[PDB]
Design a protein around this nucleic acid. Structure first.
Ligand SMILES: Nc1ncnc2c1ncn2[C@@H]1O[C@H](COP(=O)(O)OP(=O)(O)O)[C@@H](O)[C@H]1O
Ligand code: BEF
Ligand SMILES: [Mg+2]
Lengths: 93, 864, 78, 95, 24, 104, 97, 94, 87, 94
DNA sequence: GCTGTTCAATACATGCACAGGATGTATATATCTGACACGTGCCTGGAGACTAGGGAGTAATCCCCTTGGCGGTTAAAACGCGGGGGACAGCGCGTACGTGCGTTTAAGCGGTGCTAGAGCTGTCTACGACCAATTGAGCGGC
DNA sequence: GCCGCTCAATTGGTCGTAGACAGCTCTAGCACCGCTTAAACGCACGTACGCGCTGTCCCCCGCGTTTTAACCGCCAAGGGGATTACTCCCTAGTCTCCAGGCACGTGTCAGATATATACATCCTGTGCATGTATTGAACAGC
């Protein structure tokens, strides 16, 4: 069989935060599960926000509010800052 | 770093390490061996017990009793022994159901237990020697002894003056091992090219134990030929043709003839470790052969004492031993310890275990830095071609790579081409001979396969299994939830015997007229509940009347439980061997069954643990109670009877349950069988050499006869014997001339080959004195030097020496000089046959120079 | 303010819970726990209200905030 | 009436009825204040405040049940703050 | 009584009415 | 704050390491809604990258101070459970081969 | 003539099928799915209203009210397990009796 | 907003089990919430069941297993029997 | 012997010292001898109501092998999300 | 070490470590016994059994932590069955 | 004259110093091992471009609901006191748990061997969506 | 409660894709044996902890009075939400082409480890010096 994973992007971010350290395959599968879980949480809540407003589309506003619902405290406002920055770069680029 | 968090977390310490320092060799009973006349209070009053102490060997066993013991660690072990004794005595004396033969068995058990402990006080080898300083300020020579049938844990320091009286020969063997002429550091180094080989016409004189057969000489010749070319190969001789003897003889030849002494490893199946080691002890007794087995402490002790010369040295440590025998388990457990050694030769017994190239054994052994490899197996079993390819790849890494993995079909033109090419291409490296060709003195084997009808209990089980009648099967388990994830296994179980199921016996003893205590009817059920048991009883009764003895193999240990109970209820004497039986007990069981007075009629054997390498030629009949999916395992079992040591016609019975899965297993085995058939400087002398030769001459006198030994043992560097003869004669002539010049100037220090300060008079006097000593000892007592005596000749007394010294001490000291030469005071004091060992010291009066001058005085007096 | 949740109201709530006797310190505990609960629900309710661009918090987005807490409430729609 | 019975009498009275037990206007003021800290000038649909009161009171009643079990576990009858702190910690609300 | 459920429920008494004669 | 966006890959245009193409495919294939705006996968990939960087930073600190060169599940557990907000995010998650926090 | 009456259901199979589409629960919804789901909803509604009707009779009331729904749900072990995380508005508690 | 409700069908089901009794408007809204909640929980589970199997369609098989996951004990056994009976009578009609 | 073997019971395979170790990791100083059979009951109830859901997922897939994914899904239904086995 | 410390030594050891504390084979046999009530002759992928062991050990450890808090609340130090029952009831695990 | 004792000369025995040889230690050099980088090939998914339709965004209007104020009445809440009950602390005793020790049992890892079940591929057919038109039921007001 | 109107459901036909069915292949799952070692179990004994009992003091609950606030009714105004309509922009769908990621092999670079060589120190042996004992000869006395 074949399967596909965030592992290479986890390695990239790791080398951005700790360039000398490695990560075990088990820990990498933990990180892959964590990314999949958080993705499904944010997407499922954005889906509920869309349905509650009779909207047909998921936009940045849905993702932003789902992030403000799902993430606690400072982790939310920092994630929202990273998202709005990335969307600004993507739009102006 | 490039990303940084901007969250205002406080710092955290994640270190999980901690210490618990905030929370901060005795005379106990080890074992109770036996008891004799001087409830538990009757035990205290009536009885006296043979105690084995901790930290002491079985030589120090003492009779004791509770008041003599007092309070000490291990007393609970004496309580438990008394409790067991009480239960034994109640069954023997009280129990009105005890039978006469049960009384005989309970009396025999006393012999069976005591016959073990009677070995443990006999030395098997001396490991090492020390001098222990006493609180008395004197010191005692001690020997570290390993006892018979004991590991290297519970090896014990013992008084050498006692051990020499107890076991002289083992001390002689230890002294020989210390004086060894064949120590791995003196190994020859044919690194570029090995010397050519001429066929041996007769076995070399160093092969001690007996006579090799012509086919065994041929095998050794083939092994030596391959070694000379540098080729690895397989000993594939049919099972029981002396592949062990051929391997020991080849390693012996390699050491003595080539002088490739060096660490050789032999990795062996556990059940055969004794037979390998007993072969070395018979056929090559001069080899320092070590067996590496036992618990962590035992083999750690082996590594510490046995492996190294100077174990405390800290660089390029070198090896004391010629051969290491090891079980496959320890090549995995001690992979790092053994893999660090520069092994010169590796032999693998029952090599076919390597057939899975992915196995951890294969990876481990293949990582060892061995210079040459050798496989032994009577069944290079091509159960598939990839499994043979794994063996050949193990012999030939990166050479003769079998990458044509395709399995042979029954018929193709490409199949016949590839099989024929493979056959001729492998043939250079596999040597195989067959008993009917080799040794017509063997009586024939023959095999009969017996079809057997299922019993009705078996028939209903087999039906319920096929129909997956879970409810009826659960009723057959009395509510134990049945499962069929491996239907094949359950069908084979039903085909052998229903008592393999949880309550099939209960379901027949529920015919309660058969039930409970009813000796006759419990056996009646146990036999009649399966066809194989009925036929087996008919066979076993015939064989018992004829007087045959039978090995019964099974691929199920619970079937051996059923057979063992059946035989015990008939009162038949039998032995049992399966992989749960520990090494010592299986050693005893095999020795006993092969004992010529042995009463045992049956041997129950597991086909895996008991099918490999055992010697059971004193049986003549084999029953394969169920057949394996691999035919070679059954042939290996049949070979366990059909040894070269056989002396009667061997009869093999297979039992096949007719109309069952068993015959499908037979047909798949036969198809694999037919597939397997289808595949089947020297003159240059430096200053150090002159100095060493001079010291050797002053030690041994005339070296020119011993010189082979002095070169072999590292007394002298490797150089031509003629050049040492020349330089010896030149040095003696120069000494004579310099003494004559001294005499002419008087009416002796000289230089030789640029060596300074050589004394001529010391050479001539020492040569004269040792020549006289040698001729005197050889002339009086060539055969038995310890009987030598000086007669009436009495020299001047010792000059106030602190030790009793007499004509006897002079005699033994001269024997020491005869054995070890002058100046060898360490060996002379250490050799316990001389008795001096206490008398001689390093401020003490009998110093090295004092004893040397005493020896020179004695030799002058006896010359005078 | 929180002090409007009176001592006897907390008594009545404890009585429905079957409390036989009630220490005089329980009132400020209960007020704290209530304030924390209301804060957690109103945060999510107001988040739904503000995402909808409304200015009125509605029974439906309170019911959604409770469904987020795993405390689904029947009988207010939804 | 037997001495000290009235507490059990109250237990019967309040368990039998379904009334809301907090005064409505004080709870509305509390909700207004807390929302005002999140977002100024919010309005509340009155059914929203009723739903929020019903959920709040059901939560407090179930918490007092768990607290009373913690008090009984201590061989004690008076509920103490540490009983609430235990119930909330076990039920996972120490957040 | 047009529709029934086959559930093997136990019997239950739902009457909440109560008295205090045991407190008197 | 700025990026050259020279590469075709949409992540590089956003300045993200995480795969915006995947996040868009998964949002679209997951039946989360009838329609998926083009900004959604950028915002979501950015949030996923932020959270994974935050965890890996704390896990690397925990590996460093435990004096090991590789992050292992022990360190992921130590990082999550020592951080109040990651612990509140993952308060219902079990990490395989994680332990407990030692009492100290 | 309705789809509900061919199944024999009181609940609207057409409504359920429309809701299964509107919610975009999947790309496709099979023809049997809304009949099955409407039948299960009808069964659970009947079992609830059965037990609430009993509770209303035991309290000598002609209308079923939230008190009776709360009593019916909480006294049944299985409905109480289905509705364990659920708060019923204007429900009381079960009395200790 | 023509708000959808189950009220008329809850009434019709009520009159099959207790035709003598009525139902309060509040209790009716609680029944409406109950029906919506159970619908959404079953449809959600059937959805992720379909996704786990990489199927695109929600069938009676998915609803049946979503019921067996969601409903406890005998309540499941009877709900599954009712559902399969209704699907059978539907499939044997026009 | 053939017949002397005692099967114990499979729940008794969760030994007293295993429960001791679990309680130690939970920080328990001292432990009453009745706790073992309570702990075995609690474990059996948990493991039953997880395995029932896992088997329900396996049977809906019409598989015969229970897989780490439908265990992970059965746990996710309980709100006991497990990281490290996929999903 | 001082008397009575070994309880603390064990707590310190087992809280440091991360291995699974139940023996693997006994647990696998228990899992197969339990599963066979729901469907006979299921096979198990080995990682499924490891996932069940990880989940059940994490559950038992957290339950013992809550039980210990209950025992400390009694002001005992021995945990008693009623502590487990109280923890599970407040959890709503019944 | 011979013998015994004393005196003198010589040889042996011991201690110390020097020389020589071996062992240990440190540094330099080379080899060994592992990882990363680069090249090549293949396959798949993303990116880019174009088109059309629908959804969202914007604007306007209308109506309902929420907010704020006022007034009166009644019940609830708050304050205060006294007495009794319950909580907490201290003490004693008995049992249960825990620690040590010996012995037995079963787990863990490695191997053996087969078979079933999972996963993938290909083809064909039926079912579900989409679109249009018609019919019947549900909501709203009289 | 009944009747009228509007909106959603139902009916029919067509088209395309998904699912079902069949076959094939390979991996992983099941059972059992071998071998070792550590863990688990049985048993005894001693001490500590749990639980019962008692006493005392403080806090809570019952009761009465007084005071305050909530609730109910009513009125008014404005804002916000909802609906309707139109238009523009965004996204989905399709097609084509490029790039990235998987994948493996090979070579080179980097880092660590092992081995070789040199120097220092310690141990042992030999030689020389000094002291003491032994041996030989001479002298004295019987
Ligand atoms: N040269 C020999 N002389 C006498 N007996 C021999 C000789 N070679 C082998 N044997 C007998 O064969 C037995 C060993 O069997 P062996 O051939 O070693 O098994 P295999 O070679 O199949 O592993 C020994 O007990 C020994 O008596
Ligand atoms: F093959 Be032999 F019998 F060991
Ligand atoms: Mg052999």
């Amino acid at each position: 069989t074949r399967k596909e994973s965030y592992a290479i992007y986890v390695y990239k971010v790791l080398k951005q935060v700790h360039p000398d350290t490695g990560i075990s395959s088990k820990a990498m599968s933990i990180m892959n599960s964590f990314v999949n879980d958080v993705f499904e949480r944010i997407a499922g809540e954005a889906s509920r926000l869309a349905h509650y407003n009779k909207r047909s589309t998921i936009t940045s506003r849905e993702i932003q509010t789902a992030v403000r619902l799902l993430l606690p405290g400072e982790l939310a406002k920092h994630a929202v800052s990273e998202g709005t920055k990335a969307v600004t770069k993507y739009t102006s680029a | 770093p490039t990303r940084f968090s901007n969250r205002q977390n406080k710092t955290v310490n994640y270190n999980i390490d901690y210490s618990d320092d905030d929370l901060l060799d005795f005379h106990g009973i080890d074992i109770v061996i036996n008891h004799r006349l001087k409830d538990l209070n009757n035990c205290k009053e009536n009885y006296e017990f043979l105690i084995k102490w901790t930290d002491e060997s079985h030589l120090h066993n003492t009779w004791e009793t509770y008041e003599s013991i007092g309070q000490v660690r291990g007393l609970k072990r004496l309580d438990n022994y008394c409790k067991q004794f009480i239960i034994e005595d109640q069954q023997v004396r009280l129990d009105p159901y005890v039978t006469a033969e049960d009384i005989e068995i309970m009396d025999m058990e006393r012999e069976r237990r005591l016959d073990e402990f009677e070995e443990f006080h006999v030395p098997e080898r001396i490991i090492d020697s020390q001098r222990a300083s006493l609180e008395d300020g004197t010191s005692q020579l001690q020997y570290l002894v390993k006892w018979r049938r004991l590991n290297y844990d519970e090896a014990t320091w013992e008084n050498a003056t006692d051990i020499v009286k107890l076991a002289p020969e083992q001390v002689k063997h230890f002294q020989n091992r210390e004086n060894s002429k064949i120590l791995p550091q003196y190994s020859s180094n044919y690194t570029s090219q090995r010397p050519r080989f001429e066929k041996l016409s007769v076995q070399p004189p160093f092969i001690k134990g007996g006579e090799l057969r012509d086919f065994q000489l041929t095998g050794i010749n083939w092994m030596a030929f391959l070694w000379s070319k540098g080729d690895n190969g397989i000993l594939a001789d049919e099972m029981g043709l002396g592949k062990t003897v051929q391997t020991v003889a080849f390693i012996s030849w390699l050491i003595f003839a080539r002088r490739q002494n060096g660490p050789h490893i032999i990795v062996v199946p556990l059940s055969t470790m004794p037979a390998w080691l007993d072969t070395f002890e018979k056929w090559a007794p001069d080899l320092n052969c070590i067996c590496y087995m036992g618990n962590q402490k035992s083999r750690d002790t082996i590594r510490e004492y046995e492996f190294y010369t100077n174990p405390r040295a800290k660089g390029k440590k070198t090896m004391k031993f010629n051969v290491l025998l090891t079980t496959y388990e320890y090549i995995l457990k001690d992979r790092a310890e053994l893999g660090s050694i520069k092994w010169q030769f590796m032999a693998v017994d029952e090599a076919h275990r390597l057939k899975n190239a992915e196995s951890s054994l294969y990876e481990s052994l293949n990582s060892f830095k061995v210079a040459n490899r050798m496989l032994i197996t009577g069944t290079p079993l091509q159960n598939n071609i990839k499994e043979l390819a794994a063996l050949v790849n193990f012999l030939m890494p990166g050479r003769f790579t079998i990458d044509q993995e395709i399995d042979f079909e029954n018929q193709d033109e490409e199949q016949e081409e590839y099989i024929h090419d493979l056959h001729r291409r492998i043939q250079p490296f596999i040597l195989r001979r067959l008993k009917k060709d080799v040794e017509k003195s063997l009586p024939s084997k023959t095999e009969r396969i017996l079809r057997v009808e299922l019993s009705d209990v078996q028939t209903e089980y087999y039906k319920n299994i096929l129909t997956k009648n879970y409810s009826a099967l659960t009723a057959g388990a009395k509510g134990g939830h049945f499962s069929l994830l491996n239907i094949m296994n359950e069908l084979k179980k039903a085909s052998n015997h229903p008592y393999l199921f949880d309550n099939a016996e209960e379901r027949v003893l529920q015919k309660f007229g058969d039930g409970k205590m009813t000796r006759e009817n419990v056996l009646r059920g146990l036999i009649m509940s399966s066809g194989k048991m009925v036929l087996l009883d008919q066979l076993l009764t015939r064989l018992k009347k004829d007087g045959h003895r039978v090995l019964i193999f099974s691929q199920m240990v619970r079937m051996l439980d059923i057979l063992g109970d059946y035989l015990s209820i008939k009162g038949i004497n039998f032995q049992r061997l399966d992989g749960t039986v520990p090494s010592a007990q299986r050693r005893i069981s095999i020795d006993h069954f092969n004992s010529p007075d042995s009463n045992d009629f049956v041997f129950l054997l597991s086909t895996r643990a008991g099918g490999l390498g055992i010697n059971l030629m004193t049986a003549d009949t084999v029953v394969i109670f169920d057949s394996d999916w691999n035919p070679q395992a059954d042939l290996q079992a049949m070979a366990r009877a059909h040894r070269i040591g056989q002396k009667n016609h061997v009869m093999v019975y297979r039992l096949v349950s007719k109309d069952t899965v068993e015959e499908e297993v037979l047909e798949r085995a036969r198809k694999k069988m037919i597939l397997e058939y289808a595949i089947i400087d020297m003159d240059s002398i430096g200053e150090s050499e002159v100095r060493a030769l001079y010291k050797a001459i002053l030690k041994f006198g005339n070296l020119k006869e011993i010189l082979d030994e002095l070169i072999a043992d590292g007394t002298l560097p490797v150089k031509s014997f003629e050049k040492y003869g020349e330089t010896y004669d030149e040095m003696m002539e120069a000494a004579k001339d310099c003494v004559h010049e001294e005499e002419k100037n008087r009416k002796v220090l000289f230089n030789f080959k640029g060596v300074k300060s050589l004394n001529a008079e010391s050479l001539l006097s020492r040569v004269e004195d040792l020549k006289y000593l040698k001729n005197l000892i050889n002339s009086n007592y060539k055969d038995d030097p310890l009987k030598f005596s000086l007669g009436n000749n009495t020299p001047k007394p010792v000059q106030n020496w602190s030790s009793n010294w007499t004509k006897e001490e002079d005699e033994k000291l001269l024997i020491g000089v005869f054995k070890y030469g002058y100046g060898s005071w360490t060996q002379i004091r250490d050799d316990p046959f001389l008795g001096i060992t206490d008398k001689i010291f390093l401020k003490k009066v009998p110093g090295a120079i004092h004893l040397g001058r005493r020896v020179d005085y004695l030799l002058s007096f006896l010359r005078g | 303010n929180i002090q409007g949740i009176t001592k006897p109201a907390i008594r009545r709530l404890a009585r429905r819970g079957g409390v036989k006797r009630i220490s005089g310190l329980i009132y400020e505990e209960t007020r704290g726990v209530l304030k924390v609960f209301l804060e957690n629900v109103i945060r999510d309710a107001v988040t739904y209200t503000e995402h909808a661009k409304r200015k009125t918090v509605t029974a439906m987005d309170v019911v959604y905030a409770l469904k987020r807490q795993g405390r689904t409430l029947y009988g207010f729609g939804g | 009436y037997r001495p000290g019975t009235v507490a059990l009498r109250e237990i019967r009275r309040y368990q039998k009825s379904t009334e809301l037990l907090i005064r409505k206007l004080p709870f509305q003021r509390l909700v207004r204040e807390i929302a005002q800290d999140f977002k100024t000038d919010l309005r509340f649909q009155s059914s929203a405040v009723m739903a929020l009161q019903e959920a709040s009171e059901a939560y407090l009643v179930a918490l007092f049940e768990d607290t009373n079990l913690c008090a009984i576990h201590a061989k004690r009858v008076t509920i103490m703050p540490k009983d609430i702190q235990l119930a909330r910690r076990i039920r996972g609300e120490r957040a | 009584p047009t529709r029934f459920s086959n559930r093997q429920n136990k019997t239950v008494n739902y009457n909440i009415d109560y008295s205090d004669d045991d407190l008197l | 704050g700025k990026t050259r966006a020279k590469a075709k890959t949409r992540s590089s245009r956003a300045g993200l390491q995480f795969p915006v193409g995947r996040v868009h495919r998964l949002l679209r294939k997951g039946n989360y809604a009838e329609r998926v705006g083009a900004g959604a996968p950028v915002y979501l990939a950015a949030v996923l990258e932020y959270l994974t960087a935050e965890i890996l930073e704390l896990a690397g600190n925990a590996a460093r101070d435990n004096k090991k060169t590789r992050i292992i599940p022990r360190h992921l557990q130590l990082a999550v459970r020592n951080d109040e907000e990651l612990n509140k995010l993952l308060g219902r998650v079990t990490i395989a081969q994680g332990g407990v926090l030692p009492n100290i």
